[PDB]
Write a protein that binds this ligand. Structure first.
Ligand code: 4NC
Ligand code: 4NC
Ligand code: 4NC
Ligand code: 4NC
Ligand code: OGA
Ligand code: NI
Ligand code: ZN
Length: 328
């Protein structure tokens, strides 16, 4: 078996290998990449997402989110307080202000230490889930707005045509902005391109050990667990690498830099934080191997977890019992 220790693998496709997206994902999996739950892909040197990032300041962040923490330094929840709209130019200026800017630090490790020590004492503002794309329309390779759709994948594999669309989302981050422990909707893949700015650190649990993380989460967030059988779908729970280690949860970490892609694999729990002002673009996608994960994906129906219009059809076709119950 390839990659039995479930290490995060890093790939350097040639420009020829970068043409066929589906084929390269399949290649990565043939090398065991999916066992980690996360892979890094460094594009060939000949490739670029767009010419420049010079004219992005007038993009609007309609609903910036202030991420307010509760709990302990290594075990906390965050809730998102809505703030007034601001442009990306205004957001960048805010990110670089004394209140919000990245502190002096020696290296990524020092910054990671500072993050877990001090995150709960601040409330950074995140511009998340902004529908849009920063890929040039002429970028033909790994353009996250030109991928085959999940709806077409389902149709190709299962022969059923369904409604729905899926399009990319932009994320504008600043120091300490945080993404909570989660898998994707319907345990889909995701792909994430860091367009510009400071790095993003990722933590990931191998899919074969995802239930170990769930069990720990139930212990660490007992009220949340009682409220919903799939409360990690709420995207509110953070657990530090120190606490994971103390509880013997298998995981890995890696830092993504500007110009790099990350792929998360079905049922790969992940969490992380931004180092400073940056912009990422991400989208969910599927492969034939995803279908069985989609069938088995847990669902939130306590009401908390927000779900796209397109996720309806996935549940309807792949989990008809759960769909029928959700109706009545
Ligand atoms: O940027 N890419 O991905 C490229 C650039 C040139 C090529 O000839 C190619 O096959 C891929
Ligand atoms: O703020 N809360 O609700 C919290 C904070 C930490 C926890 O471990 C928790 O179960 C709930
Ligand atoms: O709050 N902490 O630091 C904690 C809480 C629970 C744990 O099991 C742990 O190893 C650390
Ligand atoms: O455990 N699962 O994954 C299940 C259990 C029942 C279902 O009806 C389902 O669609 C998935
Ligand atoms: O970048 C973020 O804030 C969160 N991204 C993801 O969870 C992802 O790409 O799957
Ligand atoms: Ni994700
Ligand atoms: Zn719920």
């Amino acid at each position: 078996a390839q990659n039995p220790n479930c290490n995060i693998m890093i790939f350097h496709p040639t420009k020829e290998e970068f043409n066929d997206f589906d084929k390269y994902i399949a290649y990565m999996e043939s090398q065991g990449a999916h066992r980690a739950g996360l892979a890094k892909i460094i594009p060939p040197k000949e490739w670029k997402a767009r010419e420049t990032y010079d004219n992005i300041s007038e993009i609007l962040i309609a609903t910036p989110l202030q991420q307010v923490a509760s709990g302990r330094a290594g075990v906390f929840t965050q809730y998102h307080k809505k703030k007034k709209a601001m442009t990306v130019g205004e957001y960048r200026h805010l990110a670089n202000s004394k209140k919000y800017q990245t502190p002096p630090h020696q290296n990524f490790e020092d910054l990671e230490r500072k993050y877990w020590k001090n995150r709960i004492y601040n409330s950074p503002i995140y511009g998340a889930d902004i529908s849009g794309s920063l890929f040039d329309e002429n970028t033909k390779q790994w353009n996250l707005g030109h991928l085959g759709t999940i709806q077409d994948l389902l149709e190709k594999e299962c022969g059923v045509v369904i409604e729905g669309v899926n399009t990319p989302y932009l994320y504008f981050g600043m120091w300490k902005t945080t993404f909570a422990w989660h898998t994707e909707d319907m345990d889909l893949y995701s792909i994430n391109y860091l367009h510009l700015g400071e790095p993003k650190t990722w933590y990931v649990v191998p899919p074969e050990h995802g239930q170990r993380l769930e069990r720990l989460a139930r212990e660490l967030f007992p009220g949340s667990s009682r409220g919903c059988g799939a409360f990690l779908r709420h995207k509110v729970a953070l657990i530090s690498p120190t606490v994971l280690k103390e509880n013997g949860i298998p995981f890995n970490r890696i830092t993504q830099e500007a110009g790099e892609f990350m792929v998360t694999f079905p049922y790969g729990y992940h969490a992380g934080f931004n180092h400073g002002f940056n912009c990422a673009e991400a989208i969910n996608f599927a492969t034939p191997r995803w279908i069985d994960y989609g069938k088995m994906a847990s669902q939130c129906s306590c009401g908390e977890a927000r779900v796209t219009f397109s996720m309806d059809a996935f549940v309807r076709i792949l989990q008809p019992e759960r769909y029928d119950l959700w109706k009545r």
